[PDB]
């Protein structure tokens, strides 16, 4: 809350958006720990722990916490680091859990 | 019916520590029923309520429960009391709880008697309560004495013999309390024969088990022998166990072994 809200874009996409899948390098991951400087640690669904930058259009536009499903784009020149591109608000995450693009051993439910 | 204050006057005295059951609160303060005395309300001022700063009235007042209190000013023409709760010391509340508990026990006993006899509680207090408080200073202490010594009801006129008989029945049934005097003796004997000496000391100690005070030697371990007594007067058991200690020392010293004292007789 606050007087900040009226300065915003007022982009009201409350209705159910169509979830975006993974495309040739964009992959799903889970936030493991929150770091500083606007950077996060994402355990990808491949047995690797990538370091994902909180990225443009996402920095102060959506607020993300520990244990959040996420979509992240890799970089072919440097595999260790990557960029968080989209965030799924815990509803379509269930849908992906049933469809199982990610290993179901990562069970994160409220 | 519940009336007839325990103490000397229906109206309170000056600076008498009182004992409150809160009923409701108005804007000015709390009008509170007084349970230490008969029924008359007291006024507890809001500014004189809480030791801490006043922030939550209902958190501290607790409508429907009992608490400590102190009287400041009294009215002796129609009946009014000024009361405080902030100015209660850390230790006075303990004597307040004990006085509440004993006075409430007496109140419950005599209310039971009045309900059984259907006579107003004031008349039963007229025949029982304050002559007893004059004799002993506390009706509950005199009740305990009447449990032990029945000369308590001598010199007082009851409404009927049934009243005293059923009061005695109730006090024996409900106010029934013997203190376990326990001591520990360490037998450090290394002599040739001690089992015979231990048995002789056993007999010497157990033969003095009187009709009202039965002293028994309980066995738990090799050195530690427990001595148990039920002291009804609490001033005779220690001498009984001291005599037992003398007997066991006399038995043990001459045979060759030694005995040591670990825990003397104590309540």
């Amino acid at each position: 809350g606050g007087k900040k809200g009226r300065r915003g874009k007022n982009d009201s996409d409350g209705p159910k958006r169509e979830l975006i899948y993974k495309e040739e390098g964009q992959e799903y991951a889970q936030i493991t720990k929150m770091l500083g400087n606007g950077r996060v640690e994402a355990s990808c669904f491949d047995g690797n722990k990538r370091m994902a930058h909180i990225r443009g259009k996402l920095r102060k536009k959506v607020w993300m916490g520990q244990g959040d499903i996420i979509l992240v784009s890799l970089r072919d020149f440097q595999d260790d680091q990557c960029d968080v591109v989209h965030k799924y608000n815990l509803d379509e995450a269930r849908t992906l859990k049933n469809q199982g693009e990610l290993p179901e051993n990562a069970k994160i439910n409220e | 019916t519940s009336h007839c204050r325990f103490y000397e006057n229906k109206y309170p005295e000056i600076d008498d520590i009182v004992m409150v059951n809160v009923q409701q609160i108005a804007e000015m303060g709390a009008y509170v029923k007084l349970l230490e005395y008969d029924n008359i309300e007291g006024m507890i001022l809001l500014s004189e309520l809480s030791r801490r700063r006043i922030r939550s009235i209902q958190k501290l007042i607790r409508v429907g429960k009992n608490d400590v209190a102190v009287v400041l000013r009294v009215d002796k023409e129609k009946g009014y009391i000024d009361l405080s709760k902030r100015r209660v010391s850390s230790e006075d509340i303990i004597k307040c709880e004990e006085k509440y508990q004993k006075s409430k026990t007496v109140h419950s006993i005599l209310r039971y008697c009045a309900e059984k006899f259907q006579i107003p509680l004031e008349e039963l207090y007229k025949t029982i309560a304050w002559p007893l408080s004059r004799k002993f200073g506390h009706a509950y202490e005199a009740f305990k004495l009447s449990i032990i010594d029945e000369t308590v009801w001598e010199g007082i006129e009851p409404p009927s013999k049934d009243v005293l008989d059923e009061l005695k029945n109730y006090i024996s049934k409900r106010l029934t309390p013997a203190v376990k005097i326990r001591a520990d003796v360490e037998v450090s004997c290394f002599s040739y024969e001690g089992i015979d000496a231990i048995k002789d000391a056993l007999k010497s100690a157990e033969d003095m088990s009187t009709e009202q005070m039965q002293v028994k030697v309980k066995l738990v371990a090799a050195p530690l022998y427990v001595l148990t007594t039920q002291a009804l007067d609490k001033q005779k058991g220690i001498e009984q166990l001291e005599s037992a200690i003398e007997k066991i020392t006399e038995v043990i010293t001459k045979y060759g072994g030694v005995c040591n004292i670990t825990m003397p007789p104590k309540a």
């Binding site: - | 290394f190 024969e193 371990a221």
Partner: protein
């Protein structure tokens, strides 16, 4: 239809029950294998040695069935101070048809004299060939006084080695050398870990065991795989006990003596003290025959210090109220076995570890107590029980004057101070009094690595006597 307890009672009655010993049998005609002796009392003491966290109580209960207490709420799992007690009656099957290895069987104390053969197809009974008492010794580096006292008491030995762990175990060598000290060659080596051992690895471990025991005095010690959890390979143990271990020389002309290892206070709590019992000395009779109601005295007895620093020794006089074997009340005592002598001794006197390894002599005999003892000691070159990482296992130093050393004189654990050192003899000053009767072979331990370490054997040749005050 019949309950199992009724079946056991019927077997017990058919097995002969427990015959009661005669009040006064012809003592000169009795032998440790006689029926009146064998039916209710053991004659051979067999000790168990092994490393900690190896399993000896489990092996003991697999062999005998009598569990060791493992008491005190803190010694329940780690170590035990007092030796364990167990009783197994050795039985043989008379039928020639059944194979010899499973003919023998160790049965519990309450087993009948002739119980049925549990093997299916054999309707034979069992013949009581020998009664033995199984005692567990503490295999822990600090627990040496009790272990050495037990080894003194023991007539047979059982060494336990774990196959899966390291082949050379220095505590096993410690116990074996301690047994060699006290003239005991009847040792049956037993491998505890055979279930979890491979075909060739077990052969290699056995070859290593044979390699280790080459220069020691014990040469033909039998070695037998056993199991403690599956509870198999027990009959072969009985066969080897019967064969390899004959009866030690112990007969009726020798003077009556007792060596007490443990003391018990018999006072059941809760019940009133009017019905109580005296004090129990748990002792082995390495020589002599006792009866019901005899007159005895503990020679070291009470130790006291005067204001002048003189050590007074009070012989604890006592009338033997009764003697308890494993099963029931006996009337005569067979030498060479652990017995609970319940005498008029104070239960307080038998409260703590007080009567730990003390000599007791019957009236009409005078074991001699000493303060300063002229001893003849033999040491070894290398300390046993030290785990060196491949560099010249610890070297034994010659004893120095005025050094506190733990001497186990047969049963008495005393801290001796060296007065002088000679080529083979020494003078030991004892603050705690100790006795000497005939030989009382002595185990020597030194404080080097913060704990007692066995260094060699010794024998008493002389002593400065003290006259007890009656």
């Amino acid at each position: 239809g019949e309950t199992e307890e009724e079946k056991r009672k019927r077997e017990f009655e058919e097995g002969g029950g427990l015959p009661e010993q005669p009040l006064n049998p012809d003592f000169s005609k009795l032998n440790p294998l006689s029926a009146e002796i064998i039916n209710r009392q053991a004659t051979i003491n067999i000790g168990t040695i092994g490393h900690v966290a190896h399993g000896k109580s489990t092996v003991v209960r697999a062999i005998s069935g009598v569990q060791t207490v493992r008491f005190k709420d803190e010694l329940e799992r780690n170590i035990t101070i007092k030796l364990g007690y167990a009783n197994a009656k050795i039985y043989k099957c008379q039928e020639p048809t059944c194979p010899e290895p499973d003919c023998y069987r160790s049965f519990k104390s309450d087993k009948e004299i002739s119980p049925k053969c549990q093997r299916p197809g054999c309707p034979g009974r069992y013949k009581l060939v020998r009664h033995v008492s199984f005692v567990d010794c503490p295999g822990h580096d600090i627990l040496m006084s009790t272990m050495l006292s037990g080894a003194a008491v023991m007539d047979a030995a059982l060494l336990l080695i774990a196959g899966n762990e390291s082949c050379p175990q220095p505590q096993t060598s410690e116990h074996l050398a301690a047994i060699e000290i006290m003239k005991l060659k009847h040792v049956i080596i037993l491998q505890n870990k055979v279930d979890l051992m491979r075909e060739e690895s077990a052969l290699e471990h056995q070859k290593s065991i044979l390699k280790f025991i080459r220069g020691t005095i014990a040469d033909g010690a039998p070695i037998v795989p056993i199991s403690a959890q599956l509870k198999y390979n027990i009959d072969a143990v009985n066969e080897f006990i019967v064969k390899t271990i004959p009866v030690p020389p112990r007969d009726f002309m020798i003077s009556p003596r007792l060596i007490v290892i443990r003391s018990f206070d018999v006072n059941k709590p809760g019940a009133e003290i009017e019905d109580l019992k005296g004090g129990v000395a748990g002792g082995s009779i390495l020589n002599g025959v006792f009866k019901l109601g005899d007159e005895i005295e503990i020679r070291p007895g009470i130790v006291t210090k005067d204001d002048k620093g003189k050590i007074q020794c009070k012989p604890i006089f006592s009338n033997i109220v009764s003697l308890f074997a494993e099963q029931n009340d006996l009337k005569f005592a067979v030498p060479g076995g652990l017995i609970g002598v319940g005498t008029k001794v104070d239960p307080t006197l038998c409260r703590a570890d007080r009567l730990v390894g003390q000599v007791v002599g019957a009236k009409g005999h005078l074991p001699n107590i000493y303060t300063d003892i002229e001893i003849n000691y033999f040491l070894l070159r290398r300390l046993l029980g030290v785990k060196t990482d491949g560099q010249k296992q610890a070297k034994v130093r010659k004893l120095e004057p005025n050094e506190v050393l733990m001497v186990n004189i047969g049963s008495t654990a005393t801290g001796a101070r060296v007065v002088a050192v000679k080529a083979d003899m020494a003078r030991l000053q004892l603050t705690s009094p100790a006795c000497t009767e005939i030989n009382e072979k002595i185990a020597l331990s030194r404080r080097i690595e913060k704990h007692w370490r066995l260094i060699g054997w010794a024998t008493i040749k002389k002593g400065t006597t003290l006259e007890p005050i009656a």
